[model samples]
Target: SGGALSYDTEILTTEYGLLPIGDIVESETECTVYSVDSDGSTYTQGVAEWHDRGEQEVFEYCLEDGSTIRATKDHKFMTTDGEMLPIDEIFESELDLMRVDSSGDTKIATREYTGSEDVYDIGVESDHNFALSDGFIASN
Candidate 1:
């Protein structure tokens, strides 16, 4: 209900309510999210945190770490006073930090936002040699 109530419903639903992700309500971006508990041995997308930014809402889900299995964008619904949503990105890149710093720089001293494969100075051509994310530290 409204929003605050949804939070309570979310917690209860995870604990004892429905007990799991049910049939996702039909919408622009139909997706079912679950509330999962990290058990050292598995990764399940149980429940995600959805925040309503009034007219727009964001449903952020987590699959592993930096990766998410599903996501949706929504706008208010005029008929049912509900919302019309759409899946923005389905996270094709599994949670690996690229495995290569395509365009950023990281030193033993600091990590810089070396941009991405999308960042380029128009026509700055040169020898593209250093492309390794060997400096990354993964989680256990």
Candidate 2:
């Protein structure tokens, strides 16, 4: 299974606002999610599939604006530079990550171990990433 976020993690949707990842997975319905283009423009893409990665070790990444994302170490995020890198490879000093907010790239404030939890991920129809409830853009 692909790296995933905690079950409680919320994903941004075009029609449903922010819905918990687990709910999205359980619904099993076709829907659109917020996604970003190669040029940094935002759009919506249909949900292709959902995944259950089961219980796994996770980390909480705190952003400069005080938002946090909890995901597996291998979960990838979209960087401001147009690169998608896994959480374990991203370095705050070298890269700024993209956020759905208008304030531009947000730096990682801190990262802490948040223990194991049930995790989920979703696939986008054409895009490989989606925005989270906290505004962080992430890979599926």
Candidate 3:
């Protein structure tokens, strides 16, 4: 009902490689995902919970570095300044987003409504954030 990623979106994991967000619903074991520290350093954290947010209107965000992510408008992403802002609110502001492997923050190139789809979200232990396969960091 809140933050959700599209079904096809893959998240960076510590054990199973890049995993589709939707697949987590069927997983009985806990998952370890790539997360970041307050100092902007990367680490791994266990997924404390997973949610099936139902079918929701999703938006696609293309980054300047040629990477993209699809999620519900309410899904929040990590900014370079260490703040978590919702996708809808992000559109109105000029802020760069954090990337797991890059030292430089990636800027959003374009954003568009991508219709409805089943979406999912996960709560990462203490971090509350996870990295997508494309390297962008997202808030739970």
The candidate that wins on TM-score is: 2
TM-score of 1: 0.17
Model 2 Cα lDDT, one tens digit per residue, 1-140: 46888888887777767678788788886577777887788778777778787889888887767787788767677677887787656745557766573453366678799778788888765678877787467785
Steric overlap count per candidate: 7, 0, 0
lDDT of 1 by residue, 9-121 (tens): 11112223332111211112212222112221211233223223222132433332232211122211111111121112112311222222122222222111211111110
Tens-place lDDT digits, model 3, residues 1-140: 37688889987887767788777765744678778887888788877778887888888877666777788766677676888887656655867776564343366677888789888887755778877786467785
Q: How many residue pairs of model 3 clash at the backbone?
A: 0
What TM-score does each of the candidates earn? 0.17, 0.85, 0.84
Off by over 4 Å in 3: 102-105
Top lDDT: which candidate number? 2
The list of candidate 2 runs beyond 4 A from truth reads 99-105
Each prediction's RMSD to truth = 20.5, 2.2, 2.3
lDDT of each model, Cα atoms only? 0.19, 0.74, 0.74
Query: Which 10-residue window in model 3 sums to the lowest lDDT?
Result: 99-108
lDDT of 1: 0.19
CA lDDT for candidate 3: 0.74
